[PDB]
């Protein structure tokens, strides 16, 4: 009951000549795959672990100033000299202070002054990098059966976890009773970890863009330092004051942790405390059903009473789940299940948990089906004690069409060109659409990188207005389309 009730669940239907289908797995989503004569399976990317990180840079968020010293030079006599100014561990600045007989100098005028203080780091945020070949994606594959899922969450016989790494392009999962499943996932194109940094500040971590991380205006260490005392730009974390031009002072600016939390607004939080593992991103996989057979097809059928132990529950995805218990003999058998009209002339809806069987006859079976819009009747068992449970599905096929179109648009806005690989068979139209999407997305991401959703909306409005007031009818249509897409992306961004 995990892929049922995630609310980010996609039904990929059918395979291609070859028995393979293309699915993109996201961390917060689920993929349930249905093919004719094939068992329904639930796919879930549940972990992405980055191994063997290398620190790219170390930033200073909280510093302290000690050993402050100053030196002065009388006017016209050049610059003051501080011995500390030879130690890069000291932050220094030069200024001018008016001098004279009163200030202990000789001639009158602006005498140079240099103040120095030992910069020390109290708290730092470490940015780490990983090679794409050191990523490990954990994918759970559970056969969509009514079997009791597991003794507990810790160890589940029902679910089969496979680890996907760039080292092997093929991963096999032995689903007991169903054959084997072949996952051929592309870990090199889900996230580009050559442009990404793993930034941990203080028991919190984020997945940030590498250039953004290197453009941060904070003091930093090279990451190969090992000494931790030679910071590159310490002036960003101190302020020198000469208010009246008669005294130079230096103070430390204060902890930059809240400022860094503000700066991290658009990043995705990850876990780096133990293991350096994160839960964001997708994984394009080619699922091969060549060696997936149904389970318990040699069982005959159940000739006995079925009782509903949990009332029919409507799922977030237009599907109903029925929990039934078997009371008859011949314990391992196939549950007679169908969704028909009132007169039972026609089959109206399809079963999601294909080939349902009762194994022990004491353990109930959660059957999931997709009933039709309107009135349907779930017929369970044979006529001697046959169950007939009415159901009404509140919706329409046009509403489902609109919702699916919106879901696909959102997926395209999230996965970009990878959206064409989702549930895709190796069709010509899908390939050409993906090529066009790649080109258009390259142009769009060149034109809109580093802008906020409000800027996106303003630009979309401007472009759509320009298209509306365009002499060319083709230019008008093209500009209006670009503006509408830009407005949609601005609305659907920052998530």
């Amino acid at each position: 009951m995990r892929c049922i009730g995630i609310s980010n669940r996609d039904f990929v239907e059918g395979v291609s000549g070859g028995s393979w289908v293309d699915i993109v797995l996201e961390h917060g989503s689920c993929v349930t795959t249905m093919a004719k004569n094939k068992p329904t399976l639930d796919f879930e990317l549940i972990k992405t672990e980055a191994k063997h990180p290398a620190t790219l840079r170390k930033y200073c968020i909280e510093a302290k100033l000690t050993n402050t010293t100053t030196a002065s030079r009388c006017p016209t006599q050049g610059e003051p000299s501080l011995n500390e100014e030879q130690d890069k561990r000291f932050v220094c600045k030069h200024s001018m202070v008016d001098r004279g007989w009163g200030n202990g100098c000789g001639l009158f005028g602006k005498g140079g002054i240099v103040t120095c203080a030992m910069f020390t780091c109290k708290k730092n945020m470490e940015g780490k990098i990983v090679q794409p070949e050191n990523l490990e994606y954990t994918i759970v594959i559970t056969p969509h059966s009514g079997e009791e899922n597991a003794v507990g969450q810790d160890t589940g016989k029902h679910g089969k976890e496979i680890k996907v790494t760039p080292q092997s392009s093929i991963t096999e999962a032995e689903l007991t009773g169903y054959g084997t499943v072949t996952m051929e996932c592309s870990p090199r194109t889900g996230l580009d970890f050559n442009e990404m940094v793993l930034l941990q500040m203080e028991n919190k971590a984020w997945l940030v863009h590498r250039q953004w991380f290197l453009d941060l205006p904070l003091p930093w260490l090279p990451g190969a330092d090992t000494q931790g005392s030679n910071w590159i730009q310490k002036e960003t974390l101190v302020t020198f004051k000469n208010p009246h031009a008669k005294k130079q002072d230096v103070v430390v600016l204060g902890s930059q942790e809240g400022a860094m939390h503000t700066a991290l607004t658009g990043a995705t939080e990850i876990q780096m405390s133990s293991g350096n593992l994160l839960f964001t991103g997708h994984l394009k996989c080619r699922l091969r059903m060549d060696k997936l057979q149904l389970k318990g097809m040699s069982y005959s059928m159940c000739t006995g009473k079925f009782k509903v132990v949990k009332e029919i529950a409507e799922t977030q995805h237009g599907t109903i789940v029925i929990r039934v218990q078997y009371e008859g003999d011949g314990s391992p058998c196939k549950i007679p299940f169908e969704i028909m009209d009132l007169e039972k002339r026609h089959v109206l809806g399809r079963l999601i948990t294909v080939n349902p069987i009762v194994t022990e006859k004491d353990s109930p079976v959660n059957i999931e089906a997709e009933p039709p819009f309107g009135d349907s009747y779930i017929i369970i068992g044979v006529e001697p004690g046959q169950l007939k449970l009415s159901w009404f599905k509140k919706g329409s096929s046009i509403g489902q069409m609109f919702e699916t179109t919106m879901r696909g648009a959102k997926r395209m806005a999230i996965l970009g060109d990878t959206a064409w690989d989702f549930g895709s068979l190796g069709g010509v139209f899908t390939s050409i659409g993906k090529a066009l999407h790649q080109v258009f997305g390259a142009i769009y991401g060149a034109a809109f990188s580093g802008v906020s959703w409000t800027m996106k909306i303003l630009i979309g409005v401007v472009i759509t207005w320009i298209g509306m007031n365009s002499r060319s009818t083709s230019l008008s249509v093209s500009l209006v389309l670009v503006g509408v897409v830009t407005l949609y992306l601005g609305v659907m961004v920052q998530a």
Epitope: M1, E148, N149, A150, V151, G152, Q153, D154, K307, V309, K310, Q325, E360, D362, S363, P364
Partner: antibody, heavy 119, light 110 residues
Framework: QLVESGAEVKKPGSSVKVSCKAS????????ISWVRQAPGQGLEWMGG????????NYAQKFQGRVTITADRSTSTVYMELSGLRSEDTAVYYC??????????????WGRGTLVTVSS | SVLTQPPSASGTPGQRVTISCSGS????????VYWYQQLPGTAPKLLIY???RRPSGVPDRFSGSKSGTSASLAISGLRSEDEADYYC???????????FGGGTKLTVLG
């Protein structure tokens, strides 16, 4: 892996809070429920909590007299019983289950805490 | 709505005894059944779950028997140590809360 509060003594018409520590792993992955054993008597189910969600459910015996809460900062689950009396004298247990609507196998049982109500 | 269990049971070493736990359809026969043994002064232990499954570490002598609306528990290879109070735990849809049987204090002539 579950630590419950030490032996306590109370008085009639009082409120007692019973605390159970967790392992952190069983705090956001399992559920916790409270069972009371009267002196020389059988087990009794008071209520349960799923710490990450926190919406507790209570037996009709104690509905309105008990309040179960979980401290997510300290991974602790608390049982408070108000309006105590002689009957409420019993040892109190906390155990964890799979947090599924159908799963109630209490594999890990708290060592228990004795609450005595007397004039 | 309340699980009914025999107050006590007796046996001899090597001679298994069966403990019955009967309830309504909503109580038992529609939900899993769990069996616990409670030694005096100690927390109850989970003997079997899902009406016949023994958690790892439970000796195979324990059997989980379930019926249409009643359940039974038996202890093969009875020993002096098995003497304890045995409870059947099962969520009952009616009463919307887990319910326990009256308990059974198995007696062994040690």
């Amino acid at each position: 892996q579950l630590v419950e509060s030490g032996a306590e003594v109370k008085k009639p018409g009082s409120s007692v809070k019973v605390s159970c520590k967790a392992s952190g792993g069983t705090f956001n992955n399992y559920a916790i429920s409270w069972v009371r054993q009267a002196p020389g008597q059988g087990l009794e189910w008071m209520g349960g909590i799923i710490p990450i969600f926190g919406g507790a459910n209570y037996a009709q015996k104690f509905q309105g007299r008990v309040t179960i809460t979980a401290d997510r900062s300290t991974s602790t689950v608390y049982m408070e019983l108000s309006g105590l009396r002689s009957e409420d004298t019993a040892v109190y247990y906390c155990a964890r289950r799979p947090q599924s609507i159908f799963d109630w196998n209490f594999d890990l049982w708290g060592r228990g805490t004795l609450v005595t109500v007397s004039s | 709505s309340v699980l009914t269990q025999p107050p006590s049971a007796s046996g001899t070493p090597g001679q298994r005894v069966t403990i019955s736990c009967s309830g309504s359809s909503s109580n038992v026969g529609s939900n899993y059944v769990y069996w616990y043994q409670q030694l005096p002064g100690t927390a109850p232990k989970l003997l079997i779950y899902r009406n016949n499954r023994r958690p790892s570490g439970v000796p195979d002598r324990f059997s989980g028997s379930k019926s249409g609306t009643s359940a039974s528990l038996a202890i093969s290879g009875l020993r002096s140590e098995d003497e304890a109070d045995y409870y059947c735990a099962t969520w009952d849809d009616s009463l919307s809360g887990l319910v326990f049987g009256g308990g059974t204090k198995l007696t062994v002539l040690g």
